[PDB]
Amino acid sequence: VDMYIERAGDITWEKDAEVTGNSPRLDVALDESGDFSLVE
Amino acid sequence: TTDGVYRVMTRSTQVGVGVMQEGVFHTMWHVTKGAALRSGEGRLDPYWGDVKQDLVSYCGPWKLDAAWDGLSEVQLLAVPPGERAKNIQTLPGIFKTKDGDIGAVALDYPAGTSGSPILDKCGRVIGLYGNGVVIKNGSYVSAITQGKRE
Numbered sequence: 001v002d003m004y005i006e007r008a009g010d011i012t013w014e015k016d017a018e019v020t021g022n023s024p025r026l027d028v029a030l031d032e033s034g035d036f037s038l039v040e
Numbered sequence: 041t042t043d044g045v046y047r048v049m050t051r052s053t054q055v056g057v058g059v060m061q062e063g064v065f066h067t068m069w070h071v072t073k074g075a076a077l078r079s080g081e082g083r084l085d086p087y088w089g090d091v092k093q094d095l096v097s098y099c100g101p102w103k104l105d106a107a108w109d110g111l112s113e114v115q116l117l118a119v120p121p122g123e124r125a126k127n128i129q130t131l132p133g134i135f136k137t138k139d140g141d142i143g144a145v146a147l148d149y150p151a152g153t154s155g156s157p158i159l160d161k162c163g164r165v166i167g168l169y170g171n172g173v174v175i176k177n178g179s180y181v182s183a184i185t186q187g188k189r190e
């Protein structure tokens with residue numbers, strides 16, 4: 001399997017972007033395999 | 041290894057994204073599982089990684105050390121499969137864990153967007169997108185995953 005990288009852009013903050021998405025406050029656990037879960 | 045954001049492809053399908061900074065390529069472990077990466081005519085080998093953090097670096101140690109300030113809006117520089125890079129500004133939420141709080145962005149993109157960088161207002165990479173949770177309505181929230189610069 002040929003895994004390869006290709007440039008996609010410059011890393012630059014964009015001025016005058018409008019905020020989207022909410023800001024959830026979540027109780028979370030992280031296991032030793034790197035998986036996050038929600039604490040119920 | 042010029043600085044910038046890159047797609048991670050398999051031959052093609054886009055399986056992720058990563059950041060080249062200071063000669064080191066940074067992505068999420070689940071994107072490559074440490075496999076070698078072709079870059080033009082060269083090969084990049086894994087140097088450091090951690091399954092629990094879900095991070096891997098190539099060519100040298102992890103270089104990204106900017107931290108979310110816990111207060112300010114951030115930008116996901118999303119590089120979705122088949123689409124141009126785009127900046128999405130958001131106020132992070134919080135993953136509250138037994139080991140501390142981690143900023144988290146409520147932005148939902150295809151699996152192959154994994155590794156896209158999240159930026160502060162100075163353009164520094166405060167972490168990578170794509171290890172997260174699915175909430176009750178089916179939408180996604182990603183940790184702002186940052187490594188340690190030793």
Ligand SMILES: N=C(N)N[C@@H]1CCCCNC(=O)[C@H](CCCCN)NC(=O)[C@H](Cc2ccc3ccccc3c2)NC(=O)Cc2cccc(c2)CNC(=O)CNC1=O
Nearest residue numbers: 034035037038149150151154170171172173174178179180
């Ligand atoms: N709305 C959804 N599901 N959006 C996701 C957005 C993916 C962004 C990039 N990240 C990933 O691919 C990682 C890989 C794995 C890294 C693991 N350490 N992924 C994830 O973190 C999650 C992990 C996960 C999974 C289930 C959880 C349930 C409860 C609580 C927490 C949970 C966490 N994995 C997924 O979300 C997998 C998934 C679950 C349900 C449905 C889909 C995909 C179909 N969606 C897509 O086919 C594209 N979108 C999507 O796949």
